[PDB]
Amino acid sequence: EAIVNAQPKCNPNLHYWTTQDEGAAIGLAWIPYFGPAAEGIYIEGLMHNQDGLICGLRQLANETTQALQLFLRATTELRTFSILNRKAIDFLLQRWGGTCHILGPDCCIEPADWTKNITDKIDQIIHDFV
Amino acid sequence: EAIVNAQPKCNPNLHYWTTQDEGAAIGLAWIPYFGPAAEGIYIEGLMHNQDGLICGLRQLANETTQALQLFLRATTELRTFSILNRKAIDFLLQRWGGTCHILGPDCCIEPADWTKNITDKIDQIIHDFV
Amino acid sequence: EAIVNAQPKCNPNLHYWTTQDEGAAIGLAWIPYFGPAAEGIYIEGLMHNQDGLICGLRQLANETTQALQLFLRATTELRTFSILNRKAIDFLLQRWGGTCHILGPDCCIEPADWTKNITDKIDQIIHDFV
Numbered sequence: 001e002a003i004v005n006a007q008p009k010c011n012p013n014l015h016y017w018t019t020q021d022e023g024a025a026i027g028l029a030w031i032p033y034f035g036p037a038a039e040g041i042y043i044e045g046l047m048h049n050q051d052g053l054i055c056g057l058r059q060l061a062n063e064t065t066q067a068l069q070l071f072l073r074a075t076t077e078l079r080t081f082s083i084l085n086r087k088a089i090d091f092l093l094q095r096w097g098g099t100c101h102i103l104g105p106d107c108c109i110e111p112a113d114w115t116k117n118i119t120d121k122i123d124q125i126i127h128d129f130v
Numbered sequence: 131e132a133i134v135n136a137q138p139k140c141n142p143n144l145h146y147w148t149t150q151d152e153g154a155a156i157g158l159a160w161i162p163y164f165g166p167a168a169e170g171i172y173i174e175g176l177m178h179n180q181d182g183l184i185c186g187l188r189q190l191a192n193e194t195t196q197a198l199q200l201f202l203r204a205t206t207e208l209r210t211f212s213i214l215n216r217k218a219i220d221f222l223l224q225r226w227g228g229t230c231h232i233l234g235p236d237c238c239i240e241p242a243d244w245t246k247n248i249t250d251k252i253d254q255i256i257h258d259f260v
Numbered sequence: 261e262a263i264v265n266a267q268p269k270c271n272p273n274l275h276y277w278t279t280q281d282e283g284a285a286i287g288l289a290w291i292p293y294f295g296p297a298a299e300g301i302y303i304e305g306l307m308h309n310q311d312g313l314i315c316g317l318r319q320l321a322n323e324t325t326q327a328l329q330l331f332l333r334a335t336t337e338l339r340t341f342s343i344l345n346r347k348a349i350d351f352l353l354q355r356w357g358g359t360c361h362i363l364g365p366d367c368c369i370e371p372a373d374w375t376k377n378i379t380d381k382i383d384q385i386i387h388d389f390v
């Protein structure tokens with residue numbers, strides 16, 4: 001489904017903050033006792049609207065809210081950390097949750113290079129005829 | 131292993147309640163501020179004992195308790211939400227956790243349709259003989 | 261990467277404690293009301309330094325701390341239980357997260373036994389010639 005920004009405005013640039021899971025620690029800075037305080041663990045970056053990604057992203061987050069709110073309504077977990085892990089699992093189950101019928105539309109198996117390994121090796125049983 | 135109900139009685143019908151992860155929201159009902167209170171988020175349904183599923187299910191839950199209690203004894207999590215996700219992961223690891231030896235018993239790869247794509251395409255190298 | 265113990269000493273034996281997820285319960289011992297208290301749920305064992313595993317293990321845990329501390333710094337979860345599950349998911353995504361190109365280096369599909377099922381069944385179309 002296409003994402004069409006339907007907001008009164010779009011800030012086309014995204015000045016973001018995040019954390020780094022394992023920033024190349026400098027010396028002992030990784031030791032909690034010596035390291036940064038809560039305020040100083042953030043990195044920043046600036047992204048522009050190439051391919052319209054920023055305006056699309058603002059619209060996507062907006063459109064995500066209904067399903068996210070409904071998901072939160074139905075869970076009894078107080079804080080939910082597992083959405084991305086569950087999506088990773090669902091990505092795998094959609095592809096590998098059943099028998100992979102080769103050359104079927106729902107089987108992500110490419111036998112290309114290797115059909116050329118047997119059809120190319122027929123001239124070792126037909127052309128080798130003596 | 132077969133499930134054999136060994137209870138003094140069986141209620142053969144299951145009047146159930148659950149939640150819907152993303153019920154087709156009507157208007158603004160999905161907004162927590164406007165939506166139902168805790169008591170009003172439930173859907174209901176009624177299932178009968180076709181194939182003996184209800185009596186089997188009551189027995190299954192009964193038999194599950196020992197292993198579930200022992201699992202809970204050994205975890206330090208206060209509330210456990212991850213059992214089904216872990217079972218999904220284990221489903222995948224059992225099938226795809228090693229090398230898939232095609233036509234082996236533990237490899238869920240069907241090369242059927244496509245063995246008929248090469249054995250059917252031999253008459254393009256043997257019957258085409260000129 | 262090789263693990264080289266660089267500690268002042270190594271205790272070469274590991275007297276360990278753990279829990280058993282589902283110990284073969286004896287009678288009603290699995291019922292929380294009747295079962296062991298927190299102190300009595302542990303099993304023990306003793307492992308020696310065969311293959312240098314114990315000294316390697318002490319070094320591995322030591323070397324793991326930087327990345328583990330940095331991971332903990334960047335999470336907002338108060339208690340983290342999901343590291344091993346996430347590693348299991350990542351194990352699967354590395355192998356099955358894309359299209360599996362058979363006989364490619366990142367495709368864990370063995371067509372061995374079964375290339376001998378078609379190359380062995382050529383003498384049913386070539387040697388059967390009449």
Ligand SMILES: *[C@@H]1O[C@H](CO)[C@@H](O[C@@H]2O[C@H](CO)[C@@H](O[C@@H]3O[C@H](CO[C@H]4O[C@H](CO)[C@@H](O)[C@H](O)[C@@H]4O)[C@@H](O)[C@H](O)[C@@H]3O)[C@H](O)[C@H]2NC(C)=O)[C@H](O)[C@H]1NC(C)=O
Pocket residue numbers: 006007008062063065
């Ligand atoms: C995702 O993006 C959507 C588009 O920006 C957001 O839609 C907003 O939704 C709220 C309600 O949830 C609307 O607020 C209502 O506004 C009406 C009318 O407001 C004035 O404007 C009309 C002309 O449209 C005018 O004729 C009226 O007389 C009002 O003066 C109020 O009557 C309601 O009580 C209510 O306040 C927003 O207007 C609406 N925005 C737009 C641009 O349509 C949506 O909220 C976003 N989702 C999230 C989760 O943020």
Ligand SMILES: *[C@@H]1O[C@H](CO)[C@@H](O[C@@H]2O[C@H](CO)[C@@H](O[C@@H]3O[C@H](CO[C@H]4O[C@H](CO)[C@@H](O)[C@H](O)[C@@H]4O)[C@@H](O)[C@H](O)[C@@H]3O)[C@H](O)[C@H]2NC(C)=O)[C@H](O)[C@H]1NC(C)=O
Pocket residue numbers: 136137138192193195
């Ligand atoms: C799963 O289903 C099982 C089958 O319904 C449940 O088994 C129940 O287990 C409890 C103990 O955990 C038993 O309670 C005991 O009962 C005996 C005897 O009770 C009376 O009956 C005998 C005849 O059988 C009679 O001769 C006696 O004199 C008694 O008058 C008591 O002595 C014990 O102290 C204890 O209370 C249940 O009897 C038993 N039910 C059945 C139908 O066997 C099991 O509990 C279920 N699991 C869960 C987790 O719910």
Ligand SMILES: *[C@@H]1O[C@H](CO)[C@@H](O[C@@H]2O[C@H](CO)[C@@H](O[C@@H]3O[C@H](CO[C@H]4O[C@H](CO)[C@@H](O)[C@H](O)[C@@H]4O)[C@@H](O)[C@H](O)[C@@H]3O)[C@H](O)[C@H]2NC(C)=O)[C@H](O)[C@H]1NC(C)=O
Pocket residue numbers: 266267268322323325
């Ligand atoms: C993983 O294993 C590593 C190797 O065992 C551990 O390395 C330890 O790291 C701490 C700091 O994080 C060091 O403590 C420092 O020690 C120096 C010097 O101590 C004395 O020794 C030198 C000779 O090396 C001597 O010349 C000095 O005058 C000192 O008398 C202090 O100056 C610092 O203030 C600080 O205390 C350990 O020395 C170091 N151990 C070794 C064997 O190198 C590492 O800690 C382990 N990681 C975890 C998470 O446990």
Ligand SMILES: CSc1ccc2c(c1)N(CC[C@H]1CCCCN1C)c1ccccc1S2
Pocket residue numbers: 016047048049050053054057
């Ligand atoms: C469906 S994946 C997707 C969707 C939208 C955008 C992008 C990727 N990326 C990078 C992701 C970015 C997202 C926000 C947090 C920091 N990270 C790096 C980007 C790169 C350059 C300009 C704009 C954008 S927006």
Ligand SMILES: CSc1ccc2c(c1)N(CC[C@H]1CCCCN1C)c1ccccc1S2
Pocket residue numbers: 146177178179180183184187
């Ligand atoms: C091993 S999967 C399994 C095992 C037992 C039953 C069923 C599936 N289903 C539907 C599942 C049902 C379970 C309870 C919560 C609501 N959902 C829909 C069923 C359908 C119709 C009559 C009886 C049953 S019992």
Ligand SMILES: CSc1ccc2c(c1)N(CC[C@H]1CCCCN1C)c1ccccc1S2
Pocket residue numbers: 276307308309310313314317
């Ligand atoms: C990369 S997997 C790995 C790495 C190091 C060791 C081992 C496996 N095993 C068994 C695992 C053991 C680990 C500690 C908790 C209890 N369990 C059984 C072992 C067997 C016998 C002697 C030494 C060792 S150390």
